[PDB]
Symmetry: D2
Subunit: 228 residues, 4 copies
């Protein structure tokens, strides 16, 4: 219970890692706003957050949707103190697949971070944590994301804002449960720990970086992969 | 003269690093096609390349410009064997300027590499070298570029194509003694690098002498 | 008190980071054994740990000292569950000016010793299918080249060991502190190299160590956690 | 002949990578002194170097003796090129042997040749990493040492770099698809490919490259 009084915005909180993060921050006293791409999803999020938060529909690409969501949050809870971003053959993918991945996984983090920084710097306290993609098989967006975070971290560090990245490994999610046994085994073979990580393990790391315990940790990429 | 028979496409060959790279590859026997964002810039390139190449207009942002340039090069010289791809506070950038940077420094390398690969692979030989931006609003694109190259490198390594990145540091390209001193204080070497020094590194990676080097980022910055 | 029932061995717990780590683990329920190179040093540790632990003299350079200390701990508390290798205070110097004497002493104290200690405590960790080994990097001083080799070798050793013992429930990590509070014009020269604009507290390194030693970081291993304020 | 007038000391030049490096620098005009642990080794090296150099016996763990011999016959050294089980299984003995042979020796050699380089305000120190756990610390310590030394002597015109080879067809590799399956290039590298990289870093064309680890491993 070290987040009382803090407001956290967690994108993609429908399930898996996103939901574990939202429930963990909520269980530790934060008021949580989890987002989904549809209104039904948003309502599902509101149903599990109960009195500890609310779910809102958000399209991370649309700059209009971002402004809209932030306005609803300000009207009901206040300014966002914690932002948690939850997101083929490279010579055969179409320009669409390329732009979609850059837009969704890279540019959106830039637009959201930009939208919440003003309040954070004014209050001289803030946390921006981005969750990297979960290992699903045995790149430019992921690497660009880390480069952006290290750069932003340096820029806003003096104002009391930390910007970090949590890079999960082979974590137990729907996508990994939907893989075939041969596929799972191949990946698991690449994991020293010899087991898959739980969604809660990524959430524990996020909760740590979001707390006052890590005020001096910024521009860091924390890997939670059992040794991959 | 170890490039004899090879065709190299160097984007942004108007001056500085780009031109040093184009002149070095040409001096070592390659047929060089340097590009500029205008026909005027292109002619200037033709004039310094002479009998060793030609300058063409390339809008690395238009799929049609890319295809158009590659078609001209095929008619004249053949297939491309060597491809060489040549500020403000973050929270003060507008969506528009962030998009221009990603699209100009990241997506364009993806489009160009894609356009020249099929031929390289059929030929079982190729070189793709990207030059990083010469020293915060470029960090994302820059890091994405390196990530893209390492990933592409693994994908095409078995067909004899290497994909590398050369990351220059401070390169002489004016300032007051105080500004210059501030720069020198950041470089252990104590001087600025020359455009030719980046070109020497590129020439090395493009040669057969670097056939086993791929997915590497070669820093030429005096230990910065 | 999420460390209740766990025994932690913290080397170099006399002052600074080492002591903050020892007090933090103790405050969270662990039975702590902090070490010093002298007998008087160990007693000072014993005084501040009170009923939550004890201080023992240990010379990591001496394999006879290591087993001696581990025997005392096993006789009074039990098997070591958490091992924290705390680097001493570094006193900077230039590479091309350091003699075999210093070079050898830094390797021996900063690299080989971690190897010998980790080796000494691993079996008891494996039989329990649970263990934590955390090494603290040399804190950046006021140019720390003479510690650079040993530091990089240490990280390499940890990543490698992490990969070897991960399936047994043991995590091996490294915490790399930046500028820590331990003369104002020189002050500004240091601060200017830190984006956050301030020095870190010894407690901030201890918070990171406490996190990695807990059950919440069971899936974190072979990682180097930098606590340097963006430096 | 990019190296005309330069003197290069290459340790472990008996065969493989070491010899390829020695022959390449010699072929490009350098006066080369290759070393070995024995005399047949040193003599074997002098044989293949001919009028381009000489072989000397050198136990890197002797250094001042070798540097003195080179100093009397050729001059100061301008280019210096430095050339298995589970960890919980290692004994203190093996662990120390590895640290001395692969880490401390580079420190001692670099220290022995720096004064000269500094005085001449020009120098090259290249260390070849281990070809492909018990060597994990020495290798990583080596890179850390090089980056640190590189910053220290950069203003004096000396560059310190590391070349990290991947699976290079040697004698071990002669005895497979298992390691090949690890490398994207689908083939093993040649000893000459590591030598080309070393030759490049040792030349004037690489004066602004320092503290860098150049991997030559086929995308591995």
């Amino acid at each position: 219970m070290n987040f009382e009084g803090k407001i956290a915005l967690v994108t993609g909180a429908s399930r898996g890692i996103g939901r574990a993060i939202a429930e963990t921050l909520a269980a530790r006293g934060a008021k949580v706003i989890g987002t989904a791409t549809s209104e039904n999803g948003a309502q599902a999020i509101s149903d599990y957050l109960g009195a500890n938060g609310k779910g809102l529909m958000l399209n991370v690409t649309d700059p209009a949707s971002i402004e809209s969501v932030l306005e609803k949050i300000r009207a009901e809870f206040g300014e966002v103190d914690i932002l948690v971003n939850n997101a083929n053959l490279l010579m055969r993918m179409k320009d669409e697949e390329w732009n979609d991945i850059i837009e969704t996984n890279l540019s959106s983090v830039f637009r959201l971070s930009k939208a919440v920084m003003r309040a954070m710097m004014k209050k001289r306290h803030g946390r921006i944590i981005t969750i990297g993609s979960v290992v699903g098989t045995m790149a430019a967006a992921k690497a660009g994301l880390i480069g952006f975070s290290k750069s932003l971290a340096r820029e806003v560090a003096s104002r009391g804002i930390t910007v970090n990245v949590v890079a999960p490994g082979f974590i137990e999610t729907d996508m990994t449960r939907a893989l075939s046994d041969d596929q799972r085994a191949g990946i698991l073979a690449q994991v020293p720990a010899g087991r898959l990580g739980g969604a809660q393990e990524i959430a524990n790391a996020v909760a740590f970086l979001a707390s006052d315990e890590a005020a001096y940790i910024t521009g860091e990429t924390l890997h939670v992969n059992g040794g991959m």
